[PDB]
Amino acid sequence: DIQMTQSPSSLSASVGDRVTITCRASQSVSSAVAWYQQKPGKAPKLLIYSASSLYSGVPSRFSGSRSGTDFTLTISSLQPEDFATYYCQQYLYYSLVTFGQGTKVEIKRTVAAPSVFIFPPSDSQLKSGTASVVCLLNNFYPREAKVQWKVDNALQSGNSQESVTEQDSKDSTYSLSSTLTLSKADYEKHKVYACEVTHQGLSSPVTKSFNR
Amino acid sequence: ITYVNYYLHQPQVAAIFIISYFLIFFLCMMGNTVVCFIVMRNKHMHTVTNLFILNLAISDLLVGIFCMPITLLDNIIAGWPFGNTMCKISGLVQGISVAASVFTLVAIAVDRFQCVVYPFKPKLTIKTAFVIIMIIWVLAITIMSPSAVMLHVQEEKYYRVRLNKTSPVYWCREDWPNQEMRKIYTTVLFANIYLAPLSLIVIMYGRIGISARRQLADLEDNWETLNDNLKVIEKADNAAQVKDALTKMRAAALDAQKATDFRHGFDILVGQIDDALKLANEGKVKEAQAAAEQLKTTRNAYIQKYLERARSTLRKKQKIIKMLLIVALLFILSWLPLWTLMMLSDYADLSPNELQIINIYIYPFAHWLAFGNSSVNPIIYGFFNENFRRGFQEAFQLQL
Amino acid sequence: EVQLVESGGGLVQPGGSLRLSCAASGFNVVDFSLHWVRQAPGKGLEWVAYISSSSGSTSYADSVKGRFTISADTSKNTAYLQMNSLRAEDTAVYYCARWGYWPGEPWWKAFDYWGQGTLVTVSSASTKGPSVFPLAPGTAALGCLVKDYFPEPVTVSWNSGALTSGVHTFPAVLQSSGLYSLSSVVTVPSSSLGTQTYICNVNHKPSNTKVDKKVEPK
Amino acid sequence: QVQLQESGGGLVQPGGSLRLSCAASGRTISRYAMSWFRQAPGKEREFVAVARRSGDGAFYADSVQGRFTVSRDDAKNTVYLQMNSLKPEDTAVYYCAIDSDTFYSGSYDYWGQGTQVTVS
8 A cells, every 4th residue: 555656767877877766655654665686587685674774795885765755775886786676665564565666777878779670471370370570679779669560551559569688798788579460361461561660769760661 | 743642532431431341351250250160160060062161261261361451451541551572462362262262162063063963973072072172272373373473563653642751652563564465364364263164153053953843843743643543543443544544653653763761662562553453454443443542551651751851852952052053143243343344444445534433433342342242151151051040149159 | 594495386277276385494484474475577576475473463465365375384494375266467476585573673674585486377378389480581680480389488599509699589478379479580691691591499398399490581 | 839949050170069959949848858860961860869858867879979968957948969079070960859759769750950060
């Protein structure tokens, strides 16, 4: 019931930066909030308890503080191993625990526009009665691009599913793949299939199309 | 070529001047003597702030002995009857005491800032206060030794004083190589001694006032959150808002305990909120209310005494801060005419008539106000402390 | 050294039953309250339940009330979370965490020690092998689509691991039919398209298939 | 029905400094992201930088990274592009842009005429 809102979900920062994560509680709980760090594939680790006290063994760069119902975590020097997802939990009673929505601290990088490719379905897949077209966005840093599928200048919804990789270890850039799946009967109806991409690093949308 | 009588002022104005100076001298003497007697005689009085108050009394005594009668005799008589040594001693002592008073006020304000805004920090010891007093005196010595080391009495040939012995008049003034160095030294002294400590003291006392008021407001809010939510539980009909009331009580109890035997009572109170919270979670409200009704017994037996005693220190702490603010403000207001008259006569190019009016009617008044400030601090201390009033009665009864 | 270890998490049909076990070493479960906190794939942590065996006090989240039951056996020093009538949104990684008792530091240190977490998957899909399909292509992209497989784990390599530069294997996305789809792409110079042959080898251990599909330009 | 005007520019020697500024009239800006683009003779509208909403970072192209700085003043509904160490490769027409997506998807619809910045 005690809503715990962790607004700065997106945090792009570089090594040595001083990052700050705020957390807002609905009710006026005491200094009874904790900050946890979770790296992908692992369990959360206690970083801060009692809204100000540093847990034993964790680096001293992390520091939390409280003002009213506003609890803020800070990393003075963002070490390369500080890139994880940070969660803001309130522990007022045993049965009243509400974590925050989590903030993913990523590596700051220069803007790169995605390179957009389109792949029509293979005839082998057509033999199975289904056709999946796939549009690939390659090496774009800000994970905010939007892909729209146009089939004879018609925009569809509910049939396109996309997945984005984690930030690359080499160049710290994201890659995305959007698959639009249709039946063969619904695929042979139309001839032109296009994926149109909008990116913050792109002046105009990049449209890659193929004719069937 | 001007003959001047030994006495210059009219007998009536001279009489009122000397009687006013004698009145302020007697007030300063009596007040500082009784303050020193009170601080030395009663062992419970000795603290860091009281030690700095004793230092202030010592500086005011130095002003009263080495600066006030000498200035009065300088004003009543034409020129400077005393030698160069007496004049340099008087001026140097006045400057030393001004600097010592300013630095002691700054130290007092810093100590109370640590006491109020950051009470978790350890309190300064008597030895630390004593070494701070010593370094303050050393700083005053090294900042206004140039006035004493560079000074001389100059003879003016155009005015000769006679009773039936005629002799050219003498006056002691800072004989700087040029007025530029004197002006820059005076301005830097004004900035380091008056302006910057004024701003620091004002802003720090304001921050103390903010910090002092906030602590009591939260204490009252947490106390009334526990009290009013208890009435909610008694009047609640179902277990949803008993849980909500118990949730509000728990946060307030944790907050009140954080505010600085006392923590043990909050340990029991929070545990009973948990005990009532378990019953509310199980579903039935009737036994949760009964468990909540026993929180009143521990609230009365462990929290009412905590709240009334925690409230007591807060109120008493303001009065000391207010007294220190008043004595700081009165010091700053009393020395304002002297510094502003020096600035006006140095920077603001005025008419020769304006400077003539400044020297005759404004300089003696500003000088009297600054010297009369030394007799004001004991009055403030006595009227803002019941302990000093008891010391006043004890000393008067003992000696009379 | 204290240590929470979770076990019992496995694939179950919707409406089925499961029993997670949290073994606690180092400390005794009498002196600490044991909490179950679940994290859905791609989502955040959410508190599920807790038990305090000192007082036997149990509580559950409103989303699992009446469907999960938490017990604690102190003879074996373990806790159990029996999850029955499991729904499709109960699939998640469950962590067993340790929260001390009031007063003092043990309570103020909330969830200081967690377990490694065990993953439960609630779906009615059956174990079936994937269908690998080619994605015919300065530089050009080239990959293969590995779709219609269950359960989640599947490995895709290129040229038997010889090709690792430019290879992006996207996370599997749960289809509307309960199966999974994945894409493995690689960006290679356009000159290599005409000469070098590219093969993606896809291995699905649960279905014991090692289909390797070669991709060619058009 | 919303337009946005850009100022600054001119002839600047190499290593100089310019503070371009685009102010949008007719709509609020604090909820959006304001980007700066460059068009050089024979070049197709190269991205320069972008300032997201307050509390979010400001991102730059690798060409202008470390030299340009995009500030954002929402009191006047304006964004500034402080350019420092202007090399002769920055000679281009600079456009401001405001994307209609609050999720920063880069949907640019209002651009403006741009300001010509010539470096020798």
